Every structure is written in structure tokens, then in C-alpha cells.
């Protein structure tokens, strides 16, 4: 059933990959056609935990759930503000596994400006993901959108194959952090 996006996020040696129930929250998977082409000639695929679930010392991840999703994705974590402050997260990870790793992440778009304050506190936020071959900076967009699949939010996901030895993450708000990663070979 579940499509490639829902399987990688969590809603066999073979060269054949066979309108399902995919993607709780509405959004898009950047470079979706490229990721599917890389999984056609997949020799080995496995999931190993990456950034820790409890690592978010000053950030809360127990409230990240959407009623249109029924909870949230298991591979990623939806970080919400703790108490009344949202400090800038500066998390980094270096690939210690021998095989190639696939790390994904997402950025959530709020409904309006009042929700942006009620969730991530900081008005102007950003999400900067850095690797050895990419330099991206994503700024979330806020606009009134018609409800899709139950709610009016949006989430834009990304991905990048990681070489041994480092992904640097930096976000000041509206950032769906990864909890687990996929190691390909």
C-alpha cells in the first residue's frame, strides 16, 4: 500500500518497485523522482537510529502530533517549543557507519501568524542544513491555505545521501527533525 514517501517517513534485493494511503500531513517530497530512481537498483537497505529522541534537552517532542495523522511520522520528530522560549538548535552528526547513510528532514509551514507565535515563539525563523556537498537555507512561508486531508498546514521534506565523516543542522523554529535514518549500500 503505502507509497515511497510514506514508507520512508513511516505513516529485499529486487529491481522492480511496485493512489495509496501516503503522507498524513499535506506537503511535498523534494526531488521525489530522483529518490525513487535511486531505490530501483537497491542492493541493501536498513534503518539505524541517528539523532537521539531524548537529545532535545530544551525542546519538547512529545506534543508533535497532528489530528489529520492517525500521531506523527516515526522516522522524524516534530519539535515544539518548551515552556515559553525556543532557543536556536545547533545539532550536528558525523556518519560513523561504513555504509552510505540517507538522512531526511522536513520544515513545517504554519497556517497564519498567530499560530507561528503560539508554536515556535520566534517570529522570523529559518532552517539551515549543511553537508559536505550542499548548503541549504529554508525559510518557512506563512499564508492562509485551503484545508487538505483535514488541516491547512504544510510540510516540505528533503533528503540527502551522507558519506562517512558530517551533517550540520541549525534551526530557530518550524523544523521537523529526524529521529532515525536509513543506511543504503
Amino acid at each position, epitope marked *: 500500500d503505502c*507509497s515511497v514517501a510514506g514508507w520512508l517517513l513511516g505513516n529485499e534485493w529486487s529491481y522492480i518497485v511496485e493512489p495509496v494511503n501516503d503522507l498524513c500531513y499535506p506537503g511535498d517530497f523534494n526531488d521525489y523522482e530522483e529518490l525513487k530512481h535511486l531505490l530501483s537498483r537497491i542492493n541493501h537497505f536498513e534503518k539505524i537510529q541517528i539523532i537521539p529522541k531524548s537529545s532535545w534537552s530544551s525542546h519538547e517532542a512529545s506534543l508533535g502530533v497532528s489530528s489529520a495523522c492517525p500521531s506523527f511520522f516515526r522516522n522524524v520528530v516534530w519539535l515544539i517549543k518548551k515552556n515559553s522560549t525556543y532557543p536556536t538548535i545547533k545539532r550536528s552528526y558525523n556518519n560513523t557507519n561504513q555504509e552510505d547513510l540517507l538522512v531526511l528532514w522536513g520544515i513545517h509551514h504554519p497556517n497564519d501568524a498567530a499560530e507561528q507565535t503560539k508554536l515556535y515563539q520566534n517570529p522570523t525563523t529559518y532552517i539551515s542544513v549543511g553537508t559536505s556537498t550542499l548548503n541549504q537555507r529554508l525559510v518557512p*512561508r*506563512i*499564508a492562509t*491555505r485551503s484545508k487538505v486531508n483535514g488541516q491547512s498546514g*504544510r510540510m516540505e521534506f528533503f533528503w540527502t545521501i551522507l558519506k562517512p565523516n558530517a551533517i550540520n543542522f541549525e534551526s530557530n523554529g518550524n523544523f521537523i527533525a529526524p529521529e532515525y535514518a536509513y543506511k543504503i549500500v
Partner: antibody
Amino acid sequence: VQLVESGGGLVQPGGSLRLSCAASGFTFSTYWMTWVRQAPGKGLEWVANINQDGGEKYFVDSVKGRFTISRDNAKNSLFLQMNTLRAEDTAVYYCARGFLERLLLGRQGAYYYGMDVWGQGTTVTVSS
Amino acid sequence: DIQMTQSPSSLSASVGDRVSMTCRASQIISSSLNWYQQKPGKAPKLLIYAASNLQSGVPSRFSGSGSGTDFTLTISSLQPEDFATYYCQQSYSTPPELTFGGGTKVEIKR
């Protein structure tokens, strides 16, 4: 959140006119704009689109090159000049605003458009 | 240019029946379509965004379904307040061009 279309009237065949759509209520510079016309007693027909930044604007082919569509985010309004009106252009012109998503529902996803705020519209009868 | 074909043009049903209409496309438009309700002499109103998803303000009677080529819009229990013409709008070529289909007029029998 209200849209007001103005600029309609009687235009002789071969003349020109300009429509005026004023926005009020919502942030105007963050949403696309769309004109939609409805012939008397007939169905809806799309006219034009304009991006948030006034630099990308598609057209409805049948009236391509006949008239241009411009906007001014400062004055919070959308324009629609008209030139060389034929008899088939006599219709009620609706002004609507809609957000342009890129959601991926299903196996593969494309662009998704949806107009949610519609104006009253001004009748533009173009006859002799 | 994408071509939409909605059927039937006219319709008549008593207050309380189950009315349903179809809107087919000449090209696979995925689930990128919209439904609109236009009262006589008024402005159209957004009902269904991307097939099954609903918009705030629409009663629970309306519901849309379909995926790919042709789609269907079904009304639970037809009420006398639902007398209007219902169009379907394309969205697969949203940047370049969307094509409205010839709506399906709904009339009430009493």
C-alpha cells in the same frame, strides 16, 4: 477578506476597457490572483493568472495577446486592461484570489490551485 | 489544453434524495481538481479542494472522490438550499492553464 471588482460598462466592439479589483482583509502580496469570466447563461471560463511578484503571468490562450494583466502590491489592487474587445467577450468578470500549492497526494504530485475568495464581479457588456 | 467534461448538464431530484455528478478529464490530472457552487446571480464558492479534501464552511452533505482520469461528486441528502450550478476546475497545469468544465445544474422537484 473581501474582493471588489469595478470598471464594467458598455464598450463598443473594437474599443478598450480596464477592470479594477481591489483587495481588502488579507495580505495581498502573498497570494496569486485570477480573473474568471462567465458568459450570460453559460459556464465559467478562465481569463488570466498573476504571480505574487508581478513578473509571471499566464493567459487563457483564446484571449492571448488581446489584453494584459498587471497588479500593484502597494495600492493593494489588481488591474486588467482590455483591448480590441470582440462580441464574444461580453460577460461578467469575476476576480478571485487563490494560493498555489505543490502538494504531492498520491503516487506522484503536481501543482494544485484553489481559489477561495471571490468578488462580486462587474458586468462588461460589449456590443454595438 | 486540458479538456474537462462534466455530466449530466441538467438534473432533477426531490428534497432528500441522493444526487451525484461526474466530471471527467481528457488527461490524467492526478487528484488536482476543485469543485465550485454558484448560486443564481451570485459568486462561486469553493466546496472541494483536491477531490476528497473539504473547505471550511461546507456542510457535511457534500463529498468528492476520484483519482486520475474521472472523478465524482456526491451529495448525501439533497436539501432545497442546494439549488445551484456546480462546476469543476482543473489544476494539473496550475502555473500555465486551468480549464473549467461545463457545470451540472441541479434543480429540485416538489
